[PDB]
Amino acid sequence: ILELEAERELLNPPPSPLDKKFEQWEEQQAVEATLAAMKARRS
Amino acid sequence: ILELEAERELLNPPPSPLDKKFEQWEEQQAVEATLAAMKARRS
Amino acid sequence: AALDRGNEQLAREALGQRQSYQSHTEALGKSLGEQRALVEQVRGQLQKL
Amino acid sequence: QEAPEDLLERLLGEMELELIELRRALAQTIATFKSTERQRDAQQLIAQRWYEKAQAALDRGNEQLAREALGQRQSYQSHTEALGKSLGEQRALVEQVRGQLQKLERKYLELKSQKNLYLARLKSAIAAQKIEEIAGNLDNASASSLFERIETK
Amino acid sequence: ERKYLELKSQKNLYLARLKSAIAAQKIEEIAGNLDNASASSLFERIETK
Incomplete structure (x- = not known):
């Protein structure tokens, strides 16, 4: 499980905290x- | 580890402090x- | 939108993120202009030949 | 030796092998710290349940019992501190090496990018030499040009 | 038992570092073969011709 999930991090880098x-x-x-x-539309 | 990393210093000299x-x-x-x-563009 | 509404701090990093792509822009941009001389000169050769 | 141009494509072929080999090595590095990180979480949870006992231990006036329970917790804490510090150190290792691969991949594609451009120039030169070398064979040279043979006859 | 698992725990981490180093040496050793060196770089051969 930890083996394969790591490869996801590699091929698909996750969103950075800056973009988060x-x-x-x-x-x-x-x-x-x-x-x-x-809000302005109704009023 | 120390053997090979040294060769990187040789073939690829690092940036000098002057350029740093x-x-x-x-x-x-x-x-x-x-x-x-x-900053000036907005104002 | 970054600096709009008073979040100037955030915009600084975004521009810091942009400069990396700009460095590619300047380096590749200058190279492309140089490559134009290569292709143009050789085409005249073939026309001459 | 073989043609240098052939080595250029072949040489970059092994370059790609190392990048994928490098990538797998990275992932194995990324694999382990999560295993260690999870291990830390379990132990502190084991420490927490001891704290949960410590909450009830000394409650109602049984302070003597709570002392041993905390004495039991310090053993797990020692693991917590030792492993916790190690995990923080391991973060520097993984972060620094990821920037390397990012640097390496950026460089390689640029290196491979230029390869063809100078291969094209190389083929232009041979096309420039072989085209005019034969061109002078007819008449463009002062002597030994086959053109003058016709007039001679 | 507590010591052994910790000993085996570190084994892979430095094996990973070892594979990183060989991946660091073999990647750049060939890299300088093309043009990064002042002389004997195969890149200059193209200009020579």
Whole structure:
């Protein structure tokens, strides 16, 4: 199990922590900015 | 280990300390000068 | 978007990530311009020959 | 010796073998530390359940019992500290070598990238030499040119 | 028993390092054969011709 899962790390490098905060940071706006338009849209 | 790693030092001399400060000195401007244009670009 | 809304710290790393690709851009970009002289000169040869 | 150009393709052929051989060696390195990392988690969990006992041990006034339980925990802690420090050191090993492979792979493709460009130039030169060497054979040379033989006759 | 498993535990880690070193030597030893050396590099032969 540990043998093969390691090879996945090699052939498929995982997302870096720098990019990890992207889909949380820009997503925190892709959610806020998107809902901001929706929030303003209703009002 | 120490035998072979030494040969790497021979066939491939490492960056000198004089050049080491370059990619930190000019990079300190390649970052500052680059972001200086970006900093001024937004404003 | 990085520095927008006041997250300047994050943008610094992203540009630090970009410079690595820029280094490839400058090195390869200069090489491509040089390669143009090679192909252009040899085509005139074949035309002459 | 064989043609140098043939060695160029063949030479880079073994280069690829090492990269995959290097890759497998890396993964084996990556395989082990997780096994050690998991082993650490189990032991501290064994230490935690002793702490869970230590929570109940001294409760209700049985402090004497709790002393032995913590005495039992220190043995597992010693493993925790020793293995914990080793795992942190092993992180430097794996991280540094990964940057190597990243450096090596970037260099190799660039090395193989240029190979063809100068092979193309090499074929241009032979095409430049063999085309004009025969060209002068007809008339372009002052003497011994076969063209003058026609006028001679 | 506690000592042996720890002894066997380290065995692979340095075997991995050993394979890394041979992979480090054999990869660059051939690398300099092309052009990275000042002389005797096969790359200069092309220009010579």
